[PDB]
Each structure stands twice: as C-alpha cells, then as structure tokens.
Design a binder for these strands. Structure first.
Lengths: 104, 53, 141, 141, 98
RNA sequence: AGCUCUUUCUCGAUUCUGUGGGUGGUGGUGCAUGGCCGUUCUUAGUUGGUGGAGCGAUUUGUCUGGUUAAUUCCGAUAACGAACGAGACUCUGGCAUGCUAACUAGUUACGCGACCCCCGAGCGGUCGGCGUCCCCCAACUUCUUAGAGGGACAAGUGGCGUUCAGCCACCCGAGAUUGAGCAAUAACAGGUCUGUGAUGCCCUUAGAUGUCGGGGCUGCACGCGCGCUACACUGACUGGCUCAGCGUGUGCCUACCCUACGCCGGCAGGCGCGGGUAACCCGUUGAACCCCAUUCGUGAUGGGGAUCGGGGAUUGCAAUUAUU
C-alpha cells in the first residue's frame, strides 16, 4: 500500500528544529516518497509584559518576555515501516510531533 | 450539608488565583498560564519565557 | 505569451507590484485606469514618470499595478516607484542598455526616489512616553 | 466603461437619480425620521437620500464577491464622539442597509449569494454597466 | 478531624493500600477525583491526614497547594493496627525492577 | 442559621471535658531579614599580576595633549602586558527579479468555459475589456512566508589634524551613527512582610485577628499630580473616494470562545444559523485621520459636551451608590 500522511512538528530552539526537519525531509525523498518538503509556518511570538517590581514605587520599568513557537509540516506517502520508522527516529529534544491519516 | 458556607465563585477576581501562590492580585491570565506576576517573574525561565529584547 | 517583466515599489507600509508586458499600452492600477487614482492632488505624482520620459514609450507595452498595505499617500509613492522601475526593468531585457540608462538618468536627476526605495520606517515606542522619543510628563513635587 | 471605469461620485450620483425616476424601489415608510447611524449627528440633509445609499450599495456589491449589512453598518459608521472619552468606530444602522438589500433584491440587482452575503446579479451587473456607460458618455469636463 | 467512623476507614484503608495520597488545598470542592467513595476533599482527607502526620506516621509536602502525603514506616505499623489487617500487610510498594 | 429555644427523634465512641500543644492571619515591624526591584548608572567607572616608587598603609599602571557615545584610541610617560563595565555580545527591522522551498501562503499564466456585461467596436457570430467562479494531470516563487546568504569595513577619493588617532565633504549605495536587550566595582536604613507554604520575633488564636448577610473603600468649603476633552471656517456637519498593521480565539484546574451571514427593531440591541485548535475562520483585518461634492458663516453658534430628568436594553442571583 500507500497512505497519504501529514507530519506536523511544532517546537522551539531553531537549529535543532531545523535539522529535525532537514532529516525528515532528506530521508523522506532520499528514499523517495519525495515529501512536499518542510513548510515553514510563521513562527509565533508569545509576549508577556510586566512591571519589574513585584510591587511598585519606582521608575515605572517594563519587562517583556517572549516564548517563540515554531511550526513545520512535511507530506509523506507510504506505508507500514517507513511510517513508524521515519517518525520515531527523528527523535529527542524539545519537539512535538503529530502524524495525521488523511483527508478530514 | 451546611447549605450555609458559599456564594457564587464563577467569575471575577474572586473566581481565580495563582496556581503557584493563591494570590488573587495581578494575575497573568494570558495563554492560560494563570500565574501572578510576582511568581511568573520567578518561574518564567522554567516555563520557557526568555528575555530577548 | 509575451515579453514581460515584474517589478515593485515600496513606501512606508504599502507595496505596489507592476507587471509590465508587451501590449497596446494603457496603464491600470489595481483594476482602474491610472487616470483615476485620487488622492488626486497627488495624482500628478503617479503621472510623473510618464511625463519625465515622454508619453510615447508605453505604446509597445501594457502596464498593470496592484498595491496592498500602507495608506493613501504611502500607496501613491509605491505605485509610482513600481511603474518607473517597471519600464526600466523592461528596457533592460528587451530594448537596449543606453535607453534604460537614459531613463534612469531623467528619473534619478529630477527623481523622487522612483528607482530606489526610501528606507525610512517606524521607530518603536519605548515605555515612558506614548511615542518613540516623546517622554511622558513629570511634575517633580 | 465597466462601472470601474467611472468615478465613484458621478457614478453613484447618476445611478441614484436613475433609480429615482424609475419610481419603484420601496422604502420603510420611515426615512423621514431616521438618522442612519447612532454615530450620526443629524439625519441626512437630503431626505431624498435613500436612493443614494441604494446606488452606493449596488456599486459596492458589484465590486466585490459578496457583502452583508454588518459590513455596511461599519462602512457607513463613522467616528462617534464619546464626549469625555476618545472617539471610536461605530458601524452604522442595520435596518436601513438591510432594507436597502431587500429592496434591491426586488429589482433583482442583487441576490442571495452562496455562503452568506448578497452578490450582484447578472441583471444588476448589466444594469450598472449600462448606466456606467451613460455617465461616461455625458461629457468630458 | 472530626468525621465519620466510616469515612475515616475509607481514608485509612485507601492510604494503607495506596501508600500515597494527594489533595488540592481546597476546602470546598467536596469531592475529589479518584477514590473518593465521595465525601470530602482536602478535609476529611486533609484533616485526617494532617492528624496522622502530626503523630508521625506520615510526612507531608505542601508545594503548589497540593499537599502530597507519604506514608511512613512507623505509620505503616499504625494503620496496620487500625485496619487490624493480615501481618505482611503489603501496600503501595510490592515490586519488581530491572 | 436547629444559630438559640420548645418537642423528641436521629448519628454512634469520630467527638466531648481537662492538661500539655498546634494552626492560620491581607496582624506589626522592610528602621529585625532572603529574593526581587528603584537609584547612583547604561555614568564611565573598576581591578588584579609582574616590576618600579615608599619603613608602612599605599602608589604608578589608570596621563599634560589630542581624540571618543564610552578609562574609546593615539601619544607621551617607569611601566608592561591583561581582565571587568562600555564595547564587542544578542534581539528586532529595512538592500538582496540571488539561495533552498511552500494546496493550512499567494502569483503568473493558462486551460478557461461559464456567470457574462454588453463597456466600446461590430448587424451579430466575433475582437479588445475589470471582477467572481470553475477548479485542473499548468507553471512559479516576483510580491508572501522562514530558513540559510551576502552587504557597511566610515570601503575610494579629496580637504583638515601632531599630517597620527580622528574630523569633514563626496561616490556606490541601505551610509559611518535603525531601534532595543545584556550591565561592573560598591553603596542606600530607596521600595516590597499585601507576591512568596520566603521569613524571625512579636501579637492574636474559640467569646479569633481564620468565613457568610449588609455597607465603606465611591462619604464634599478646599489644594495637588498624571491625564482626557476643548476653545472652532487648517474647523463642526451631511452624502460620497478608501488603505493597514502589531496582535487575538473555543473544545480551558472546573465554567465557557471568537463570530461572518438571514430575519425583527430608529437605536441600543434582539433572534436563527454555520465554520474555526486558526498561514484554513472572524479578516484581501475593505480602520480611523485623511480625500472629497455639499451645508454652515465666524454667533460659546452647528465650537463644547458638562450637569440633570425620563425612558429603552446588555452583564450578573443581586447594579440601589449611575458597571456599562
């Protein structure tokens, strides 16, 4: 068989994310289902703004923290082993991964 | 049993706190974090909120 | 299909893309003639390139432009830049270099940035004023 | 002229009048009383105005895939003077625009569009294009 | 702290079998998810546990308004007695490993 | 409120009663304390090694001069060679018809017919024409996107200056300085016990200083600070041109989302739907200034919208002391 498969990956520090994606992409085609290679999605900037005190009298000073979510997907078509294989290596830090069957 | 002992807690300041510290004041409710600002300052590193600019 | 280039123009917020392809020749913006445009006072600003370089030229070419972004003046500057850059991009692949240089000359001379994008862009406001350089108010005591 | 060809003010001005002559549009009996927007200071000076809005809307729809009253309320909606507070948007009435949308249907200028929102009909598309030409034709000036 | 002679057994008996307990620091939810043959929330459970701890028998950790309850050795004997149960007892450790 | 009482059932050894002992506190002290934080300070400040100079603590280095945003550099100098803050460093944003790519992003351009209008031309078939829709075994990455790439080094040149460090003009071109974040040595009776299950001691602790019903915090001759809105014809008005961007959402630590579209209502709003864990949907955020065809006409008037009266509705169990 062949099954149309979508892998989404969402996570943070870049250079790791980028080379997880690299790897899914390169082994994907390399034994060529041929992807639909990493679609980089606009990275999401969570912003929090607070006064630096806990608690106030003082030049009003402000701090803003971010948390930057990065998303990608990659489109595979196959089956059995190369599915659960290609997902599961490609594993470790900091990396959410979801795989979706097809259509709806 | 004591029908006596509660009045609505559904909404307002009184309906929420700090998952960290009980405080019903200065509460960060964005992104569902629900931490008071004083605490959030101390835990923003372990949550994944880092200073960049 | 035919000889054709694409170009763009950029002021403030509001980019303007030009597709400049061989045609009868008569110069439309988003979907209406370059004769409507209005803001209007400005309207010459967008005529400006054509006059600078002789109304003819555009007779071997069809011109269309789309602007999204910026605001009303912002847009005008972008579209005009896109059009002049367009015409020059076109003489560079199809006509000859001396002609295009002649055109960059007339524009660049009198100018308005027509072929070069103005840098100037928002500076971020900093806590303690509602502007970037504006600082709130103080009373001392 | 496509309607796109004619300037918005003259187009609307001509069509609105044409509607007036036709004599069959239909008109919430009110229209004498109504402001047209809570934001509004006074009603419309031209008590005759129902026609102008209709023309404006017909033209507004023809341009775009499909539109509905909320959008119109906002379009008509101007800035409202909070008084002590700073001014803010306030999308303009919904009865007038709705009635306008319902009435236009009667003429067939517009029809319910798929997935919500009213769209121009080919009957209307034809009608607007026709007046558009008449306006273009009138004169130069 | 206070309470029933039945609820107390529910608490002690579950504690003896689980060897651990958790309760969010709320006195209102009255009921707690998991176990709870329902009757209580921190209170009866918190108070009973708090009393159990003061006499030893259990060590309590607060952090994050949950209070995590850990049964102690001396305590195992004590609940052994309350339950009266079969010597070798054998609560929420038994185990394998590696 | 079975709180208290009358009446007499009920639970069943938990509790009660006594002793000793805890426990909470938005109780007090920041002038008893951690942390965090303001301030000196983003100022140019700070120090060691090794030597020289002194019995010694110490001193020179770390300076007359020039130069610099900066103890930044040059030079001179009994010092030489370094580190700390500054800087470099990191982040954000512009210049890349280059890079590698994209149906959860678009564009070209078909195939494009259709809707299809006639808008002009044609008598019409047919041609040129702006959009929507078709979606395709079309093509693309230009706009869009996010990753990697390069660009600025005051680079060249010319004046000036110890002819140095630098300064100024000029070219390519994004021009030397886009804008933040990061902050030393050492201090303060700066602020914080009401952020802290951080915390001492103290105080209190059943007739509580630990919760519900109700009010204050919102009581008005007067002063102050931050602001908002104004004083009009660059305007106030009515019709009409008309473009955006940072960001945001439900399916949630315990009750609940963003809302396009039909209808009713002058409004306020009411009501029926249907999509959307979202680059898909709300939202080509069709914003507002503004631009404009009118009116007003220099009258506190149409500038201004205070105060008050009546009334409609929304949130909530509850709005009276107006939530709005």
């Amino acid at each position: 068989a062949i099954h149309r498969i979508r892998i989404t990956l969402t996570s943070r520090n870049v250079k790791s994310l980028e080379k997880v994606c690299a790897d899914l992409i390169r082994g994907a085609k390399e034994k060529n289902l041929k992807v639909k290679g990493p679609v980089r999605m606009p990275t999401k900037t969570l912003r929090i703004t607070t006064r630096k005190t806990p608690c106030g009298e003082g030049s009003k000073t402000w701090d803003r923290f971010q948390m930057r979510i990065h998303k990608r997907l990659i489109d595979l078509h196959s089956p059995s082993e190369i599915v659960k294989q290609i997902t599961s290596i490609s594993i470790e830090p900091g990396v959410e991964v979801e795989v979706t069957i097809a259509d709806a | 049993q004591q029908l006596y002992w509660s009045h609505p807690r559904k909404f307002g300041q009184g309906s929420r706190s700090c998952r960290v510290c009980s405080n019903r004041h200065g509460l960060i409710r964005k992104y569902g974090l629900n931490m008071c600002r004083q605490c959030f300052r101390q835990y923003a590193k372990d949550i994944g909120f880092i200073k960049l600019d | 299909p035919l000889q054709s280039v694409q170009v763009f123009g950029r002021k403030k917020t509001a980019t303007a893309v030009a597709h400049c392809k061989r045609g009868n020749g008569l110069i439309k913006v988003n979907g209406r003639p370059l004769e409507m445009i209005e803001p209007r006072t400005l309207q010459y600003k967008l005529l400006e390139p054509v006059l600078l370089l002789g109304k003819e030229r555009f007779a071997g070419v069809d011109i269309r432009v789309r602007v999204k972004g910026g605001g009303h003046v912002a847009q005008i500057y972008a579209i005009r830049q896109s059009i002049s850059k367009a015409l020059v991009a076109y003489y560079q692949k199809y006509v000859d270099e001396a002609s295009k240089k002649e055109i960059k000359d007339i524009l660049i001379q009198y100018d308005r940035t027509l072929l070069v994008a103005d840098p100037r862009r928002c500076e971020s406001k900093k806590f303690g004023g509602p502007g970037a350089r504006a600082r709130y108010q103080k009373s001392y005591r | 002229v496509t309607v796109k060809d004619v300037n918005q003010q003259e187009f609307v001005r001509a069509l609105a009048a044409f509607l007036k002559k036709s004599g069959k549009l239909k008109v919430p009996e009110w229209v004498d009383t109504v402001k047209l927007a809570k934001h509004k200071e006074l009603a419309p000076y031209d008590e005759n105005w129902f026609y102008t809005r209709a023309a404006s809307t017909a033209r507004h729809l023809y341009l775009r895939g499909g539109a509905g009253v909320g959008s119109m309320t906002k379009i008509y909606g101007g800035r409202q003077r909070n008084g002590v507070m700073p001014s803010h948007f306030s999308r303009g009435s919904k009865s007038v625009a709705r009635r306008v949308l319902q009435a236009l249907e009667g003429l067939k200028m517009v029809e319910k569009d798929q997935d919500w929102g009213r769209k121009l009909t080919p009957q209307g598309q034809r009608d607007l294009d026709r007046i558009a030409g008449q306006v273009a034709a009138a004169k130069k000036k | 702290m206070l309470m029933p002679k039945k609820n107390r057994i529910a608490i002690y008996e579950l504690l003896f079998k689980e060897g651990v307990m958790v309760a969010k620091k709320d006195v209102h939810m009255p009921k707690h998810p998991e176990l709870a043959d329902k009757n209580v929330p921190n209170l009866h459970v918190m108070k009973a546990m708090q009393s159990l701890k003061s006499r030893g028998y259990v060590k309590e950790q607060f952090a994050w308004r949950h209070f995590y309850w850990y049964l102690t050795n001396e305590g195992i004997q004590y609940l052994r007695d309350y339950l009266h149960l079969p010597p070798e007892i054998v609560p929420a450790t038994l185990r394998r490993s590696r």
